[PDB]
Design a binder for these strands. Structure first.
Lengths: 144, 143
RNA sequence: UCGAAGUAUUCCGCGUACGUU
RNA sequence: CGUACGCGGAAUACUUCGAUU
């Protein structure tokens, strides 16, 4: 399109708050689970090992998709949140925002105050996923 | 008056080339192996499917950043030589030389085959950044 | 947790300039 | 690859404010 970046970036932002059945083609499979200001507050009577969950995001150039998924330190909750994005969902989702000119891609995830970013060129997105599902894996299993 | 580093950042910068000096405590345990501009087009005849000279990694403790480029030819004897570039105690020993009455944001980065892996986080979790950085380094260098 | 601002950094993508030519 | 900046991003650390009452 003409501008081609400003409007698509706003829809990617809004995609987070439009549940799993609203917005544009998203790289994530599961909907957002951000905690309200009140359920994140009363949860911090402990307080801020051992959060409600983690915050992850997928960025294809200027088109960034963000998520928050409540992740308890359990085997089942790990298999659940790991199904929030796969290689296919990213590739298919990136296909609608990449072109001939290589843009920057980045997957970032924060948990326990530790952030991991897997960034690279559009032509390296294939490795960014393998490295992101491997990095995401350990960060969530990072033995205290 | 809480300004400790005017300027230690540039000292950690030059530590890569002519150093470590004078006295800067570096996190890395190996000298820098950055190739020349020519050698950057000699080994690299023209990148064929890729195989680089090695990788570039950096260590940051606030605004004090250290950087190292190393050779890595995909051999196990080379993986082991580059994992000794920095360890847990080394960087921890290096981070304790740059702190303050405040939480500072540390950062490890490594680039290999057009893929970068940064592990950022407050100095309160540096112990985690290392444990996570050694796995990321090993994993990235094993694709 | 959401949104915004400043400060101090890092990293990616792209591009300019230079580098015993 | 080295240096320096330019654009657009993402991430971090400190700080400030707003978030049906």
């Amino acid at each position: 399109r003409a501008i081609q970046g400003n409007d698509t970036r706003e829809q990617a932002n809004g995609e987070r708050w439009d549940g799993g059945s609203g917005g544009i083609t998203s790289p994530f499979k599961l909907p957002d689970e951000s905690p309200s200001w009140t359920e994140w507050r009363l949860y911090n009577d402990e307080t801020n090992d051992n959060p409600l969950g983690f915050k992850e995001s997928w960025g294809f150039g200027k088109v960034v998709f963000k998520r928050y998924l409540r992740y308890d330190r359990t085997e089942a909750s790990l298999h659940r949140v790991l199904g929030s994005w796969t290689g296919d969902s990213v590739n298919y989702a990136a296909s609608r925002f990449l072109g001939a000119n290589q843009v920057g891609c980045s997957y970032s995830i924060r948990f326990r105050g530790v952030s991991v970013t897997i960034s690279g060129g559009s032509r390296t997105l294939q490795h960014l996923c393998e490295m992101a599902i491997r990095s995401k894996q350990e960060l969530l299993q990072l033995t205290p």
